[PDB]
């Protein structure tokens, strides 16, 4: 179990750690988060009390280094930093753990929610989507645009998700225009899976990461990416059977976790109705269809 200490908490802020969150008051004696499960990526995220604008946060994996959060009063945000001097960092963490100034990652033992939302998400792939190679952790915020949104403006600050475009030469083989547009199996299986992602694990990892950025930061381009990757599978007549079964589990846990009050902005009516009721895979997502119908029947 690992620890992300805080230098201090000089401004009142709501702090998220994965699907959990808590309020810290201005200058409260808060010194970080302990008992963080090893083996998973994690996200620590922030919304200031004075400006709920810009949610922002950091993806990290404690196996890759010792990370701490220090508030920067010039740039006005909580920043994640890396200490490579291990002896010095552990001396402080212990010193803090003794004074009980840390919140415990409050995982219920029965609970596989976080694993189920991050099963295929890997730090190495996150760092290719979010390019800032000098750090081992990745910053994301509500405003960052995707490479595809930039084609339709700062490239260093962009989310480099894999571009999916159903009306593109990449998606449509000459002479198979109707076939490839109405059945996207070529584009899914040859172009994207075999050609770009290499395997379905990497495809699901990017899909899961896009959903989590949409949910935790309200990042609109990430929501677009999540829905595009769902629709590409559902609009393919030929999909490996193990992929369909895994997608049903992935989406089930995503829909389960979504805040009920955010469904209006985070769920695209057209994509979900098309996917669940019209697409080739309309009968292949039993768990997802059942939770959607019982939790968000309005959208459908």
């Amino acid at each position: 179990m690992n620890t992300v200490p805080f230098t201090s908490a000089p401004i009142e802020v709501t702090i998220g750690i994965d699907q959990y969150s808590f309020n810290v008051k201005e200058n409260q004696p808060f010194h970080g988060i302990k008992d963080i499960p090893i083996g998973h990526v994690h996200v620590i995220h922030f919304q200031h009390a004075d400006n709920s604008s810009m949610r922002y946060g950091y993806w990290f994996d404690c196996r890759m280094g010792n990370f701490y959060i220090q508030y920067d009063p010039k740039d006005g945000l909580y920043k994640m930093m890396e200490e490579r001097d291990g002896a010095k960092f552990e001396n402080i963490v212990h010193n803090f753990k003794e004074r009980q100034m840390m919140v415990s990652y409050p995982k219920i033992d029965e609970d596989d929610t976080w694993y189920n939302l991050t099963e295929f998400v890997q730090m190495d792939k996150i760092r290719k989507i979010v390019r800032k190679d000098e750090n081992q952790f990745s910053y994301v915020d509500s405003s960052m645009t995707t490479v595809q949104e930039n084609e339709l403006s700062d490239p260093a600050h962009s989310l480099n998700y894999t571009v999916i475009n159903f009306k593109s030469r990449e998606a449509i083989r000459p002479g198979h225009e109707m076939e490839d547009f109405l059945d996207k199996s070529y584009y899914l299986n040859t172009v994207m899976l075999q050609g770009i992602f290499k395997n379905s694990s990497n495809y699901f990892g990017e899909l899961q990461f896009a959903f989590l950025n949409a949910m935790f930061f309200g990042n609109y381009g990430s929501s677009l990416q999540w829905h595009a990757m769902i629709e590409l599978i559902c609009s393919s007549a030929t999909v490996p059977k193990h992929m369909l079964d895994k997608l049903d589990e992935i989406l089930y846990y995503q829909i389960k976790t979504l805040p009920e009050q955010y469904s209006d902005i985070l769920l695209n009516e057209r994509v979900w109705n098309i996917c669940l009721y019209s697409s080739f895979q309309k009968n292949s997502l039993h768990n997802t269809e059942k939770i959607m119908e019982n939790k968000y029947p309005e959208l459908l």
Binding site: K167, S168, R169, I172, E177, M178, F181
Partner: protein, 237 residues
């Protein structure tokens, strides 16, 4: 974006553009089978592709053999239309290719966009105008070449005959749409108006009769009467 009453005169500027109408591509007769079920029999159809500025009509005849062994023919017909329009564009010299293609039905947008991905600078547009191009098969010479075809064939016509020697393209299109709307609302009456007088003939190289300027005014008035009538006979007014 979409073409409507506000941006009417754009049709007659000097940017090459084509209307594409697909309403006569897939044509059937519905009939009873010996068992008393219903079946369709396809008949030849056509894509109506028209330059509104010059009157050039590229009539691609769709022979019934193209449907043999195919499913979901109404969907296929939209993609076949887009395939043939794309082939037409590729066949034209670069300086004759259109800058815009306006489809008369919104269901043609995605098929045509996909077939034209190679031409990113050609704009594919819908329209809010209710154009009467479905009535093209009420023009006897056009119906005749479609029904006689034994194989796929493209035939070129000028749908304005020689009108542009005497009138503008705006006025020529206005007349064409008026004639076609009349033929669509009451074909028998419209054709009677057009041919009642045997001294006015259709030249061999023309589609419509050789009316004088004065006679076109009378004709046009007779068509505007027919349309207002049927609009009463229909709605009882």
């Amino acid at each position: 974006g979409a073409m409507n009453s506000s941006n009417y005169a754009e049709l007659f500027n000097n940017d090459i553009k084509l209307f594409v109408d697909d309403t006569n591509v897939y044509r059937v007769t519905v009939h009873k089978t010996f068992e008393g079920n219903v079946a369709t029999k396809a008949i030849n159809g056509c894509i109506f592709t028209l330059n509104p500025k010059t009157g050039h009509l590229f009539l691609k005849i769709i022979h019934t053999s193209v449907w043999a062994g195919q499913k979901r023919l109404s969907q296929l017909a939209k993609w076949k239309t887009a395939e043939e329009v794309s082939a037409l564009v590729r066949s034209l010299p670069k300086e004759e290719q259109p800058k815009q293609i306006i489809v008369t039905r919104k269901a043609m947008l995605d098929p045509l966009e996909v077939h034209m991905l190679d031409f990113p600078n050609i704009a594919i547009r819908p329209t809010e105008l209710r154009l009467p191009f479905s009535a093209a098969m009420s023009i006897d010479k056009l119906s005749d070449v479609v029904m006689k075809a034994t194989e796929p064939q493209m035939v070129l016509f000028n749908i304005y005959d020689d009108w542009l020697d005497r009138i503008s393209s705006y006025t020529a299109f206005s007349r064409l749409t008026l004639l076609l709307r009349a033929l669509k609302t009451n074909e028998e009456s419209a054709k009677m108006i057009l041919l009642s007088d045997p001294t006015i003939t259709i030249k061999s190289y023309h589609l419509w009769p050789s009316f004088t300027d004065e006679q076109w005014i009378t004709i046009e008035s007779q068509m505007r009467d027919l349309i207002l009538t049927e609009y009463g006979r229909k709605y009882n007014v």
